Paper text:
The tripartite signalling system YfiBNR in P. aeruginosa modulates intracellular c-di-GMP levels in response to signals received in the periplasm and is a key regulator of the SCV phenotype. The effector protein YfiN (also known as TpbB or PA1120) is an integral inner membrane protein that functions as a diguanylate cyclase, consisting of a periplasmic PAS domain, a cytoplasmic HAMP domain and a catalytic GGDEF domain. The third component of the YfiBNR signalling system, YfiR, has a key role in the signal transduction process by bridging YfiN in the inner membrane and YfiB in the outer membrane. YfiB can release the repression of YfiN by sequestering YfiR at the outer membrane, which requires both membrane anchoring and peptidoglycan binding by YfiB for full activity.
Crystal structures of the periplasmic domain of YfiB were determined for two different constructs: from residues 27–168 to 1.58 Å resolution, and from residues 59–168 to 1.39 Å resolution. The YfiB(59–168) construct also excludes the region from residues 35–55 linked to increased membrane attachment. The longer YfiB construct crystallizes with two molecules in an asymmetric unit while the shorter construct crystallizes with only one molecule per asymmetric unit. Analytical ultracentrifugation data confirms that YfiB(27–168) predominantly forms a dimer in solution, while YfiB(59–168) is exclusively a monomer. The YfiB(59–168) structure lacks helix α1’ and strand β1’ and has a considerably shorter β1 strand than its larger counterpart, but otherwise retains the same core domain. The two structures can be superimposed with an r.m.s.d. of 1.3 Å for 105 aligned residues. The largest structural differences occur at the N-terminus, which dissociates from the β-sheet in YfiB(59–168), and in the β2-α2 loop, which packs against helix α3 in the shorter structure but is directed away from α3 in the longer structure. Strand β1’ and helix α1’ includes residues that are proposed to form a linker region that unfolds to facilitate membrane attachment and YfiR sequestration. This is consistent with our observations from structures of YfiB alone and in complex with YfiR that reveal structural rearrangements in this N-terminal linker region, including shortening of strand β1 in YfiB(59–168) and complete unfolding of β1 upon YfiR binding. The structure of P. aeruginosa YfiB(59–168) was determined by molecular replacement with Phaser using the YfiB(27–168) structure as a search model.
Numbering used by the authors: 61 to 170
Write the structure that this text describes.
């Protein structure tokens, strides 16, 4: 369940109930131990153009941000960033790699 990486289907930007429940637990844990800040970075595969992917990455990051806000984390303490297709961690040549690029990274910055 719990992971810093949240995955999405091809061209999708929402969260199913299992994902939302997992993310609520992460959010509530961070709230409980009085963490200052969470940074949510949205990402895409490189299919489609820069702008298309930029906006998709923003929608993904916002979906995750909303779960943190609903759990009680103030918006002022959440940094939401879409990086589009620019910072892959896996191989866009393959389905498996593209799948691992379709993500939000949950970060607790120092």
């Amino acid at each position: 369940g719990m992971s810093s990486k949240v995955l999405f289907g091809n061209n999708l930007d929402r969260l199913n109930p299992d994902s939302r429940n997992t993310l609520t637990k992460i959010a509530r844990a961070l709230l409980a131990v009085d963490i200052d800040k969470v940074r949510l970075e949205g990402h895409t595969d490189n299919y489609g153009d820069e702008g298309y992917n930029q906006k998709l990455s923003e929608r993904r990051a916002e979906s995750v941000a909303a779960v943190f806000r609903e759990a009680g984390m103030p918006a002022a303490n959440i940094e939401v960033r879409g990086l589009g297709m620019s910072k892959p961690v896996a191989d866009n040549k393959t389905r498996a790699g593209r799948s691992e690029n379709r993500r939000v990274a949950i970060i607790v910055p120092a």
